[PDB]
Amino acid sequence: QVINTNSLSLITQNNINKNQSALSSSIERLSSGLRINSAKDDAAGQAIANRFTSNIKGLTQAARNANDGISVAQTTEGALSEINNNLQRIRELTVQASTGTNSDSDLDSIQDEIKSRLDEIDRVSGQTQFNGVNVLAKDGSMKIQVGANDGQTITIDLKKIDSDTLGLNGFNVNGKGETANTAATLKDMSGFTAAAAPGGTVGVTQYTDKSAVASSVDILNAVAGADGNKVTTSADVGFGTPAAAVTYTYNKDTNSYSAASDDISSANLAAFLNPQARDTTKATVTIGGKDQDVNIDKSGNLTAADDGAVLYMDATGNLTKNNAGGDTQATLAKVATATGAKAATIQTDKGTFTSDGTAFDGASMSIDANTFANAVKNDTYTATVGAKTYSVTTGSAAADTAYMSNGVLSDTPPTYYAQADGSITTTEDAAAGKLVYKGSDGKLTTDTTSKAESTSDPLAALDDAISQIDKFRSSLGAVQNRLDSAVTNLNNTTTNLSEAQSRIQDADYATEVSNMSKAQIIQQAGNSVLAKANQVPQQVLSLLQG
Amino acid sequence: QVINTNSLSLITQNNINKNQSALSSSIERLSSGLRINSAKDDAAGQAIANRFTSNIKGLTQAARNANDGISVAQTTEGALSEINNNLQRIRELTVQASTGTNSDSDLDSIQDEIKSRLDEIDRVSGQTQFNGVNVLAKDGSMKIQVGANDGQTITIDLKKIDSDTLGLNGFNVNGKGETANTAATLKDMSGFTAAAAPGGTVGVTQYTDKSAVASSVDILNAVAGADGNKVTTSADVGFGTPAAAVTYTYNKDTNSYSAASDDISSANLAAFLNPQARDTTKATVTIGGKDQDVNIDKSGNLTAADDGAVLYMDATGNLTKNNAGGDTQATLAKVATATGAKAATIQTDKGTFTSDGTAFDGASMSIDANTFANAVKNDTYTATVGAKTYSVTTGSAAADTAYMSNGVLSDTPPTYYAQADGSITTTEDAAAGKLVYKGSDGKLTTDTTSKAESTSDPLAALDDAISQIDKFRSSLGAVQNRLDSAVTNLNNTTTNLSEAQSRIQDADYATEVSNMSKAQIIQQAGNSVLAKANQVPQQVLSLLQG
């Protein structure tokens, strides 16, 4: 009974408006097929779906990468298998070649063919490549990404395999083999004669090969060869040049000989620490509880270890370091007596030094071996070796008690005894002695055999190469099995995660068709009731009778 | 008969007003489709509908959660199946390798592949994940919400599965396999404490393991192991028992220690040459340029080296040896002064001897090493080794400068530095040090591996590991079926509750359309009767006749 200013059709319109959102959402949900289409839905679901999608894509790419790794491992394994076949053939040839019934032509032919197959192995090692990467040319590792998160990879170990790595660097089966050596040749013994015969046997004559006097450098090599020997010398370069003390003993412990000397170097620091005309050395000086780092050059200015800081000596009565003192300029000469008075130390890397008075007392010097030999090659010394004492006085073998053996220094010359029957034996009694032989190198070596230039133990070396290649092949096989397992895992995981993500997205149409029917029926009923509502007002017109 | 002041239409308007509310309610109900739209209807019904709606939504979301739990269980089960297959292959390989017809190379290959697959098991254990959650990395539990009200959950048990948990920590069938060692374990360092920190770093504390003082016998094996060392000792058995001279130095050259001593053994030959109570030793005596062979027993009769010839000492004025002399009987005491006066030698195999006066001068003695060690185990000596000097005074490590390292004697004790972060390093600066480890043996070795003898009953251990993983698989299966049953129950319950809530809301349209029709018809009737009511009054105007 009101003029449309309180009409009830507004309620119907509002209800239709409330329905329209559900209608639109239902139709759109049918169209997409995914429950979550924008942030208006459960945004947490959207984020979880996005994370799941990223995981699934990364997992699939990782699976493809693992397959690629399997392929590269397969190529490498095939190459290794044929290399193994070649090595087995070479071993078979070597087994053939060991028989003594073969002429030098036969051995040469076998060597030619073996060299051919070794070059074949080298070639196939260099040749094999997989997409610009040489599998067998370098001892690297290859990382295979099979996981979604960074840092999770599988490593394939690759070794450089060739003739050098497998060994034998030229198998060389064709060298001149086992050869019998020639006899004693009594006439060749032109050494010093002596009928001493300490056993008194009338039928033996002792021959000594003199002129084997070792040189001084030989003495130095002998002492340097062994570790832990003793050498006493005077008149050394740098330290010991005044030679106030003679017994230094140089304390050879592990490496280039050390030393120990009393107050002798006071002015020799520049000569020692600066071998050349412009050398400068780092050193550490402390007064006691005050560790300061300094540079020493030609016994001149004690330049501070800073970039360009220059230290000045000051503090008369204390004699410490200060960059900004107000007295005379610092030099090594006076700081020597300063340290002697204050009982400090100036120890450096190549020698720990202290002073009492006006001269440095060396403690733990360490002179270079080559320089030491160059300095004392022509002076007197009593260098000793294990359980032996050797004397040298301004000339090699002053006492004439050092003799050069085959390769070692001995106090006794090579003694050769000549027997009555023309043989030469190392000892008087023929029951012992191992009658000496001659041949192919001189020096009258006491063996019946000359070294054969062929490979020493060919079969063992070839079996070692076979073992190496088979270990490599086993490594590749284990890696291949592990990658196959990784692929199976990653497939199962990506399937499960795909279903998981499907449970969050991907709205069930079974519910959505019924929801659409709801929305459409409500919309139709609402529009019709809106019509029925707006057909009401004209009753007031009917009342007016106009 | 009244002019609108007692109007008869008022009841008509009032009745139309009453029915208008019903008409509007019917139209609105038809538009919405729900029986209750606001509190004007049965409010208790509205509250009940709200509660049912909340319950239905909660149950649906719980069903989705249950599905997610099923998916994660499936992924875990797949990973466990892969691990189980790997373990089966390990068992098969172990059964193969138990046979005694195999060489060390075959065992090496088998152990290599077993180790490879064990590392594969560990990798698949570590890298398996479900949406940022590692199922097999911890012994945790995951709660799945399947109910509408808080606290109603289902728990899934997860166990940490890896090579450590299953046991055997390196299956190690071949031998010389590797097991991981433990960490620094700062708390175990019970050695002597020293905050000295020579580098001055505040955060470093130096710990030294004291009580590592080597015994004197340890020094003896230390000196004896190396060849050519120096040992200075007095108060020795036999030679040096009077200890007239102290600096012997024992001249170790190649083997059991030698010696060099002045005239001290004059009467000590009987004890020294005859360690037991009746021993006899052969000897060679020469009065110069002319050798004679003799036997010595307890300094008594100088029996000739013949079968039974007995030598007596003779020749006053020359002091010769005659097997047919004509003077008094021979004793070593008398021949001692004979040789001392006449400058002869009695050099033997185990010692070169001469005498001047009435006492023998030893030159090239050779004492047995074991007898030496037993003799000087509890006396003062200053034995030295390569470039080192050691002092002992009536007791092991008198100077307290001897410390027993891992296997060698060093002048410095074992130095361990503990870092601020709880790590223990061999050096103060963390850049170096090779952070120390422990494990399986103590002694704090700087190794990541400690050996382990193969196993006891390998197949039993593999079987127990299989049983563990199989039990885990069964547990996951029981839980997974649990969740399937829960999903079925939730679906049935939410369907029933949805049908329940629908029966309270959702007004029957069958009665509602009839209500609309009745309201509309009665409304038109009311409007028309209102018009007819308004058509009545003008009969009074008809009365007025104007």
Author numbering:
A (entry chain B), B (entry chain A): 3 to 548
Sentences reproduced from the published study:
Here, we show the atomic cryo-electron microscopy structures for flagellar filaments from enterohemorrhagic Escherichia coli O157:H7, enteropathogenic E. coli O127:H6, Achromobacter, and Sinorhizobium meliloti, where the outer domains dimerize or tetramerize to form either a sheath or a screw-like surface. A shared feature in all four structures is the formation of symmetrical homodimers between the outer domains of flagellin subunits, with one outer domain rotated 180° relative to the other. These symmetrical dimers are the result of outer domains being able to adopt either an “up” or “down” conformation.
A 6.7 Å resolution volume was reconstructed asymmetrically where all flagellin subunits could be fitted into the density. This seam is a consequence of a reduction of symmetry along the 9-start helices of a flagellar filament composed of dimeric flagellin such as EHEC H7. However, rather than forming an Sn:Sn + 6 or Sn:Sn + 11 dimer in domain D2, the two-seam subunits form Sn:Sn + 5 dimers with each other similar to those forming the EHEC H7 and the Achromobacter ODSs.
